[PDB]
Tab-separated table of C-alpha atoms and ligand atoms in Angstrom:
chain	number	residue	atom	x	y	z
A	3	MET	CA	-0.035	0.055	0.023
A	4	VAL	CA	0.849	3.654	-0.191
A	5	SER	CA	1.536	5.588	3.129
A	6	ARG	CA	-1.556	6.535	5.281
A	7	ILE	CA	-0.832	10.480	4.492
A	8	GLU	CA	-0.384	9.766	0.518
A	9	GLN	CA	-3.959	7.953	0.780
A	10	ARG	CA	-5.377	10.913	2.468
A	11	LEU	CA	-3.968	13.107	-0.533
A	12	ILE	CA	-5.632	10.677	-2.971
A	13	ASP	CA	-8.736	10.891	-1.203
A	14	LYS	CA	-8.715	14.686	-1.452
A	15	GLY	CA	-7.564	14.709	-4.941
A	16	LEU	CA	-4.210	16.438	-4.259
A	17	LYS	CA	-1.402	16.029	-6.657
A	18	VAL	CA	1.035	13.363	-5.338
A	19	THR	CA	4.581	14.151	-6.809
A	20	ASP	CA	7.790	12.054	-5.903
A	21	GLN	CA	8.743	14.428	-3.493
A	22	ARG	CA	5.516	14.769	-1.777
A	23	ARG	CA	5.381	10.945	-1.331
A	24	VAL	CA	8.900	10.739	0.430
A	25	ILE	CA	7.600	13.713	2.838
A	26	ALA	CA	4.204	11.823	3.268
A	27	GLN	CA	6.037	8.389	3.984
A	28	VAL	CA	8.554	10.161	6.664
A	29	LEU	CA	5.368	11.841	8.554
A	30	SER	CA	3.077	8.659	8.515
A	31	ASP	CA	6.414	6.698	9.734
A	32	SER	CA	6.960	9.097	12.380
A	33	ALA	CA	5.331	9.042	15.788
A	34	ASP	CA	8.005	11.180	17.687
A	35	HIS	CA	6.304	14.716	16.897
A	36	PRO	CA	9.210	15.984	14.654
A	37	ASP	CA	9.728	19.728	13.899
A	38	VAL	CA	10.102	20.705	10.094
A	39	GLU	CA	14.043	20.492	10.497
A	40	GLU	CA	13.502	16.776	11.566
A	41	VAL	CA	11.268	16.091	8.703
A	42	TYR	CA	13.558	17.783	6.225
A	43	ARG	CA	16.464	15.768	7.529
A	44	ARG	CA	14.860	12.540	7.249
A	45	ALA	CA	13.186	13.215	3.756
A	46	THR	CA	16.258	14.707	2.173
A	47	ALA	CA	18.246	11.545	3.482
A	48	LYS	CA	15.630	9.392	1.503
A	49	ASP	CA	15.730	11.911	-1.588
A	50	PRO	CA	18.687	14.499	-1.707
A	51	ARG	CA	16.854	16.685	-4.207
A	52	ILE	CA	14.394	17.486	-1.386
A	53	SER	CA	15.190	20.912	-0.082
A	54	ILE	CA	13.932	22.586	3.210
A	55	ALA	CA	11.868	25.029	1.470
A	56	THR	CA	10.030	22.177	-0.142
A	57	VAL	CA	9.604	20.567	3.264
A	58	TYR	CA	8.054	24.013	4.671
A	59	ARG	CA	5.707	24.209	1.772
A	60	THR	CA	4.808	20.450	1.891
A	61	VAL	CA	4.120	20.635	5.881
A	62	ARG	CA	2.119	24.005	4.923
A	63	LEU	CA	-0.234	22.083	2.692
A	64	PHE	CA	-0.609	19.131	5.095
A	65	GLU	CA	-1.642	21.358	7.868
A	66	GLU	CA	-3.897	23.387	5.698
A	67	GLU	CA	-5.619	20.135	4.513
A	68	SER	CA	-6.073	18.829	8.214
A	69	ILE	CA	-3.724	15.905	7.570
A	70	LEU	CA	-1.215	17.289	10.235
A	71	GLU	CA	-1.510	18.770	13.327
A	72	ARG	CA	0.728	21.198	14.846
A	73	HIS	CA	1.851	21.484	18.568
A	74	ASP	CA	4.050	24.125	20.303
A	75	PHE	CA	4.914	22.553	23.537
A	76	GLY	CA	6.077	25.841	25.070
A	77	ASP	CA	9.792	26.535	23.535
A	78	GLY	CA	8.143	28.202	20.210
A	79	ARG	CA	9.059	25.043	18.199
A	80	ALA	CA	6.196	23.645	15.862
A	81	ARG	CA	5.905	19.775	15.970
A	82	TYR	CA	3.858	17.980	13.759
A	83	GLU	CA	1.645	14.758	13.666
A	84	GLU	CA	-1.032	13.218	11.716
A	85	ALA	CA	-4.443	14.040	12.452
A	86	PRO	CA	-4.869	11.263	15.234
A	87	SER	CA	-7.491	8.778	14.823
A	88	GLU	CA	-7.894	8.774	18.530
A	89	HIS	CA	-7.816	11.709	20.897
A	90	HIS	CA	-4.823	12.055	23.365
A	91	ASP	CA	-2.967	14.655	25.242
A	92	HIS	CA	0.756	15.003	25.558
A	93	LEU	CA	3.337	14.723	28.501
A	94	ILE	CA	6.451	16.437	27.730
A	95	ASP	CA	10.093	15.992	29.306
A	96	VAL	CA	11.199	19.535	29.683
A	97	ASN	CA	14.748	18.487	29.859
A	98	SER	CA	15.054	16.335	26.626
A	99	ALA	CA	11.843	17.256	25.141
A	100	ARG	CA	10.612	13.769	24.330
A	101	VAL	CA	6.839	13.768	24.035
A	102	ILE	CA	4.666	11.143	25.705
A	103	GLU	CA	1.060	10.510	24.649
A	104	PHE	CA	-1.616	9.794	26.784
A	105	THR	CA	-5.400	9.428	27.254
A	106	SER	CA	-7.475	9.785	30.334
A	107	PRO	CA	-11.288	9.032	29.595
A	108	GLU	CA	-11.878	10.190	33.129
A	109	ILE	CA	-10.352	13.551	32.710
A	110	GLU	CA	-11.984	14.049	29.430
A	111	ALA	CA	-15.227	13.276	31.189
A	112	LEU	CA	-14.495	15.681	33.842
A	113	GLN	CA	-13.543	18.713	31.415
A	114	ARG	CA	-16.766	18.006	29.766
A	115	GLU	CA	-18.738	18.421	33.094
A	116	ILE	CA	-16.809	21.585	34.064
A	117	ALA	CA	-17.880	23.083	30.730
A	118	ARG	CA	-21.427	22.069	31.290
A	119	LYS	CA	-21.576	23.404	34.770
A	120	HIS	CA	-20.248	26.806	33.343
A	121	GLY	CA	-23.069	26.949	30.664
A	122	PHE	CA	-20.733	25.862	27.825
A	123	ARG	CA	-20.189	22.919	25.442
A	124	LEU	CA	-16.653	21.981	24.693
A	125	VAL	CA	-15.574	22.425	21.402
A	126	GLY	CA	-11.677	22.095	21.930
A	127	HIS	CA	-9.101	21.887	24.722
A	128	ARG	CA	-5.488	21.765	25.360
A	129	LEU	CA	-3.750	19.603	28.197
A	130	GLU	CA	0.051	19.478	28.227
A	131	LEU	CA	1.788	18.166	31.072
A	132	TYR	CA	5.423	19.013	31.705
A	133	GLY	CA	7.642	16.447	33.682
A	134	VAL	CA	11.032	15.548	34.674
A	135	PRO	CA	12.081	11.776	35.052
A	136	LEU	CA	11.857	10.363	38.479
B	3	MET	CA	-4.339	52.394	50.000
B	4	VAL	CA	-2.102	51.075	47.489
B	5	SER	CA	-3.151	48.359	44.840
B	6	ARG	CA	-2.035	44.630	45.049
B	7	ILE	CA	0.372	44.984	42.237
B	8	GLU	CA	1.746	48.514	43.727
B	9	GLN	CA	2.357	46.471	47.113
B	10	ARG	CA	4.322	43.825	45.104
B	11	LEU	CA	6.571	46.882	43.607
B	12	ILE	CA	7.009	48.164	47.224
B	13	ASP	CA	8.155	44.620	48.243
B	14	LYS	CA	10.833	44.780	45.623
B	15	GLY	CA	12.220	48.137	46.341
B	16	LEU	CA	10.918	49.438	42.943
B	17	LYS	CA	10.171	53.176	42.356
B	18	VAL	CA	6.376	53.540	41.568
B	19	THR	CA	6.347	56.252	39.104
B	20	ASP	CA	3.013	57.915	38.531
B	21	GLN	CA	2.509	55.720	35.300
B	22	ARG	CA	3.757	52.684	36.818
B	23	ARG	CA	0.894	53.334	39.661
B	24	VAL	CA	-1.864	53.896	36.998
B	25	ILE	CA	-1.013	50.627	35.252
B	26	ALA	CA	-0.593	48.724	38.617
B	27	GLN	CA	-4.116	49.873	39.441
B	28	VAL	CA	-5.729	48.994	36.164
B	29	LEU	CA	-4.079	45.624	36.351
B	30	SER	CA	-4.825	44.982	39.891
B	31	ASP	CA	-8.741	45.963	39.278
B	32	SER	CA	-8.784	43.735	36.079
B	33	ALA	CA	-10.414	40.440	36.566
B	34	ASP	CA	-11.087	39.852	32.617
B	35	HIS	CA	-7.411	38.744	31.620
B	36	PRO	CA	-6.957	41.924	29.515
B	37	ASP	CA	-4.419	42.182	26.588
B	38	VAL	CA	-1.841	45.008	26.527
B	39	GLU	CA	-4.123	47.247	24.265
B	40	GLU	CA	-6.926	46.886	26.829
B	41	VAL	CA	-4.649	47.812	29.662
B	42	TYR	CA	-3.562	50.567	27.547
B	43	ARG	CA	-7.223	51.847	26.888
B	44	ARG	CA	-7.937	51.762	30.800
B	45	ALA	CA	-4.612	53.436	31.663
B	46	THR	CA	-4.942	56.226	29.403
B	47	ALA	CA	-8.532	57.049	30.174
B	48	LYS	CA	-7.078	57.367	33.956
B	49	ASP	CA	-4.043	59.300	32.855
B	50	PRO	CA	-3.822	60.524	28.925
B	51	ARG	CA	-0.079	61.302	29.124
B	52	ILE	CA	0.261	57.385	29.183
B	53	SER	CA	1.682	56.268	25.750
B	54	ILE	CA	1.040	52.719	24.267
B	55	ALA	CA	4.918	52.313	24.403
B	56	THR	CA	4.925	52.664	28.271
B	57	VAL	CA	2.239	50.357	28.688
B	58	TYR	CA	3.996	47.545	26.774
B	59	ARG	CA	7.198	48.334	28.512
B	60	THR	CA	5.371	48.396	31.882
B	61	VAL	CA	3.614	45.374	31.389
B	62	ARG	CA	7.138	43.309	30.156
B	63	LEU	CA	8.662	44.788	33.601
B	64	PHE	CA	5.609	43.175	35.575
B	65	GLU	CA	5.818	39.868	33.686
B	66	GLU	CA	9.687	39.771	34.263
B	67	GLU	CA	9.318	40.485	37.983
B	68	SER	CA	6.743	37.418	38.392
B	69	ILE	CA	3.983	40.203	39.279
B	70	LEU	CA	1.808	39.268	36.161
B	71	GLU	CA	1.414	35.680	34.619
B	72	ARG	CA	0.932	35.835	30.869
B	73	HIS	CA	-1.323	33.600	29.110
B	74	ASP	CA	-1.645	32.686	25.230
B	75	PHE	CA	-4.957	30.832	24.521
B	76	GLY	CA	-3.866	29.305	21.199
B	77	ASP	CA	-4.118	32.732	19.030
B	78	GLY	CA	-1.079	34.311	19.835
B	79	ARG	CA	-2.846	36.990	21.735
B	80	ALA	CA	-0.963	37.823	25.301
B	81	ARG	CA	-3.646	38.070	28.149
B	82	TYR	CA	-2.388	38.995	31.743
B	83	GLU	CA	-3.497	38.540	35.146
B	84	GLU	CA	-1.673	39.255	38.640
B	85	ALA	CA	0.420	35.920	39.676
B	86	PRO	CA	-2.364	33.799	41.334
B	87	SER	CA	-1.975	32.940	44.766
B	88	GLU	CA	-3.836	29.350	44.173
B	89	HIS	CA	-3.567	27.277	41.131
B	90	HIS	CA	-6.475	27.367	38.510
B	91	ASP	CA	-6.968	26.407	34.730
B	92	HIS	CA	-9.012	28.514	32.034
B	93	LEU	CA	-12.099	27.913	30.288
B	94	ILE	CA	-12.564	30.121	27.404
B	95	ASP	CA	-15.465	31.138	25.083
B	96	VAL	CA	-14.061	30.850	21.428
B	97	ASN	CA	-16.764	33.342	20.205
B	98	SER	CA	-16.300	36.165	22.698
B	99	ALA	CA	-12.831	35.390	23.996
B	100	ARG	CA	-14.406	35.755	27.410
B	101	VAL	CA	-12.163	33.849	30.207
B	102	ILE	CA	-13.508	31.890	33.105
B	103	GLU	CA	-11.288	30.388	35.971
B	104	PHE	CA	-11.895	26.931	37.394
B	105	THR	CA	-10.240	24.171	39.791
B	106	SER	CA	-10.668	20.708	39.698
B	107	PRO	CA	-8.727	18.521	42.372
B	108	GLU	CA	-9.955	15.468	40.444
B	109	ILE	CA	-8.149	16.438	37.605
B	110	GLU	CA	-5.297	17.625	39.288
B	111	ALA	CA	-4.949	14.281	41.032
B	112	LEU	CA	-5.243	12.292	37.842
B	113	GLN	CA	-2.581	14.398	36.212
B	114	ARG	CA	-0.156	13.315	39.071
B	115	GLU	CA	-0.748	9.665	38.495
B	116	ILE	CA	-0.550	9.945	34.770
B	117	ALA	CA	3.028	11.646	35.337
B	118	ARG	CA	3.764	8.900	37.780
B	119	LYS	CA	2.913	5.915	35.682
B	120	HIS	CA	5.267	6.927	32.957
B	121	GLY	CA	8.116	7.486	35.352
B	122	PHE	CA	7.792	11.358	35.797
B	123	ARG	CA	7.181	14.064	38.381
B	124	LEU	CA	5.088	17.148	37.436
B	125	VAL	CA	6.858	20.339	37.312
B	126	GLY	CA	3.977	21.932	35.534
B	127	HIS	CA	1.041	21.832	33.095
B	128	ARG	CA	-1.328	23.929	30.955
B	129	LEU	CA	-5.081	22.858	30.731
B	130	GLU	CA	-7.478	25.141	28.717
B	131	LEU	CA	-10.895	24.359	27.804
B	132	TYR	CA	-12.382	25.989	24.639
B	133	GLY	CA	-16.291	26.308	24.692
B	134	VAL	CA	-19.115	27.978	23.195
B	135	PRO	CA	-22.513	28.721	25.043
B	136	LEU	CA	-25.067	25.980	25.526
C	1	MN	MN1	-7.473	15.491	26.243
C	2	MN	MN1	0.482	13.084	19.538
C	3	MN	MN1	-4.775	22.445	36.523
C	4	MN	MN1	-6.655	33.406	35.478
């Protein structure tokens, strides 16, 4: 098969050039929330004709198309992942910038109830935990 | 006879100029997490000699001195409040930008367990809820 991101591109009728295929594959493979520079090093290592400008343009395309989600965990560094098929939040090692995903149905339910008590429906939220190793 | 923020400047040995006093008063009085433009409008209504540049510099001074906390609820728009005595999180109306503060000891406990289970101690977190009125 083609990468998950390539398939999403086909679904939306966007052109799949050689270089876009490489970038889509890099991003589908990655689960570590790479920044644009990291996507670039991975992509250009596969196809050396890929420039950082093309990676910027391609990541913007994916973000515009809701294929990628972007995070800034505090340090102003944009980090990217596929639109997850399951909601999760993030715990970040403040020393190494390692990101861990977690889900807490209990917190999700508590958030929605807090919104309800205040007369609101929740349309979005951001939960980030900042940690140092025990 | 002084605002809470002016008291903090007194505790730090910092000169309270007339313009610092007005800006401190505006911020101590504000409960709506104002941006800098809004602080400016309120300060300049009290004393029309105060320029927008002075407001920006003074808010920056207060933030650097840990007298104010700065929030960016996702849009890049900096909003301010006195450094809170008690921890709270925020629910934001995505239509009006109105901010509601809340606490949830149950959520706070769950966050601690989540960090622990992944081998971390929590040094900080960010929880923002985005709502629309029911
Ligand atoms: Mn969540
Ligand atoms: Mn993620
Ligand atoms: Mn909290
Ligand atoms: Mn607050």
